[PDB]
Amino acid sequence: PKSMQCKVILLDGSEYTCDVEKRSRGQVLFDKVCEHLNLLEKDYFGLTYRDAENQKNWLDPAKEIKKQVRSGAWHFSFNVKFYPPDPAQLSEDITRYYLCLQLRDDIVSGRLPCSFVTLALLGSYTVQSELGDYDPDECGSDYISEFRFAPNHTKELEDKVIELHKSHRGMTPAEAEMHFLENAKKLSMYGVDLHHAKDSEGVEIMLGVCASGLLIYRDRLRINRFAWPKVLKISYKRNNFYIKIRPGEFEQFESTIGFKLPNHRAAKRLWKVCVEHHTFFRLL
Ligand SMILES: Nc1ccc(S(=O)(=O)Nc2ccccn2)cc1
Tell whether ligand 1 has an atom less than 6 A from the beta carbon of residue 68. no
Q: 75-80 and 3-9 as β-strands: parallel, antiparallel, unpaired?
A: parallel
Angle at 22 between CA 16 and CA 24, to 5 degrees: 80
Smallest CA separation from ligand 1 atom 4, residue: 188
Smallest CA separation from ligand 1 atom 9, residue: 212
Tell whether ligand 1 has an atom less than 6 A from the beta carbon of residue 211. yes
- Ligand 1 center from residue 86 Cα (angstroms): 13
> In whole angstroms, what is the distance from residue 39 CA to residue 46 CA?
12
Could you tell me if 13 and 36 are in contact, meaning their C-beta atoms sit under 8 angstroms apart? Answer: no
- Ligand 1 center from residue 186 Cα (angstroms): 10
Q: 231-237 and 223-227 as β-strands: parallel, antiparallel, unpaired?
A: unpaired
Tell whether ligand 1 has an atom less than 6 A from the beta carbon of residue 212. yes
261 Cα distance to chain centroid: 21
- Ligand 1 center from residue 207 Cα (angstroms): 12
Residue of 98, 104, 99, 106 whose CA lies nearest to 85: 99
Residue of 76, 90, 79 whose CA lies nearest to 191: 79
Smallest CA separation from ligand 1 atom 10, residue: 212
Tell whether ligand 1 has an atom less than 6 A from the beta carbon of residue 227. yes
Could you tell me if 128 and 176 are in contact, meaning their C-beta atoms sit under 8 angstroms apart? Answer: yes
- Ligand 1 center from residue 133 Cα (angstroms): 36
Amino acid found at 161: V
- Ligand 1 center from residue 1 Cα (angstroms): 47
196 CB-near residues (< 8 Å, 6+ apart): 204, 206, 261, 262, 266
CB contact burial 146-182 (16+ within 10 A = b; e otherwise): ebebbeebeeebbebbbebbeebeebebeebbbbbbe
Residue of 217, 197, 192 whose CA lies nearest to 258: 197
Tell me the best of 44, 99, 190, 210 to mutate to test the pocket of ligand 1, counting ligand atoms within 8 Å of each CB and taking the most.
210
> In whole angstroms, what is the distance from residue 182 CA to residue 197 CA?
31
Angle at 226 between CA 85 and CA 41, to 5 degrees: 25
HSE-up of residue 72 (Cα within 13 Å, Cβ side): 20
Burial category of 272 from C-beta neighbours within 10 Å (exposed 0-12, middle 13-18, buried 19 and up): middle
Tell whether ligand 1 has an atom less than 6 A from the beta carbon of residue 194. no
Where residue 132 falls (left for φ over 0; alpha for ψ -120 to 50; beta otherwise) is: left
Tell whether ligand 1 has an atom less than 6 A from the beta carbon of residue 215. yes
- Ligand 1 center from residue 105 Cα (angstroms): 21
- Ligand 1 center from residue 213 Cα (angstroms): 6
Tell whether ligand 1 has an atom less than 6 A from the beta carbon of residue 190. yes
- Ligand 1 center from residue 225 Cα (angstroms): 7
- Ligand 1 center from residue 281 Cα (angstroms): 12
